[PDB]
Design a protein. Sequence first.
Lengths: 11, 230
Amino acid sequence: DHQLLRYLLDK
Amino acid sequence: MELTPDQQTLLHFIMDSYNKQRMPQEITNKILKEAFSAEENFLILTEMATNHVQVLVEFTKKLPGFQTLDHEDQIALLKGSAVEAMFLRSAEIFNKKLPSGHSDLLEARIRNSGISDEYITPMFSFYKSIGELKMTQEEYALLTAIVILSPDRQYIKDREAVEKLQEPLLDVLQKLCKIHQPENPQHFACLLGRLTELRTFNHHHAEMLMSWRVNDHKFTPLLCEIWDVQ
Ligand SMILES: O=C(NC1CCCCC1)[C@H](C1CCCCC1)n1c(-c2ccc(-c3ccccc3)s2)nc2ccccc21
């Protein structure tokens, strides 16, 4: 649900 | 009174991460150059704000200790602070000194950008209260870090972990205020008091965007996660 944010936090 | 060697280094690291942002003049150049329609201005805003969030995430990941926080709490800090950081950065840009007459034109361009009349007056009140503080670039960078590392956001499960990351930055900011403005021993408290005004924008930000005087309010996928829109 907060995936783009979760992605940028991990990358 | 002095900053310790570790505090200098800390301040010294945070400024470098902060300066990865788009330069203020790049932004005020575009706005001052031509007047745009309200629809073009809305597009300029969403493009600017999407780049800002991307850089804010990279800035946040470099904050000492942030990456060791619980993963759900990291999301909650970014979501809870993104809009506040955008207005603080906008206030920084607005208060950069420009050639004679340029700031007046910039204010007029923003007044005529498409934003609703309801919101223009509080926005300029805040910008102007921020300019009165005569903040340095180090103070803006620290305040942004302190805003991001606020333990009192919702859904923070472990506030105590966040507090211990925020406190060393508060201590450095307090030392700078005493060094940079020794005649005003209320300066630190006044900076912190401005943060409560930032929080009010977060709470009205959705209505501020949807009342923009355009026919369609299209946001990017990244902004839809950060902003309470669409
Ligand atoms: O581009 C901008 N800001 C960037 C954002 C990311 C970080 C860098 C700054 C806009 C432009 C204003 C004129 C029309 C185009 C957009 N801006 C604002 C805002 C007005 C309204 C704003 C808003 C945001 C969210 C929700 C509800 C409302 S921010 N204040 C400025 C002060 C000085 C220079 C630009 C400034």
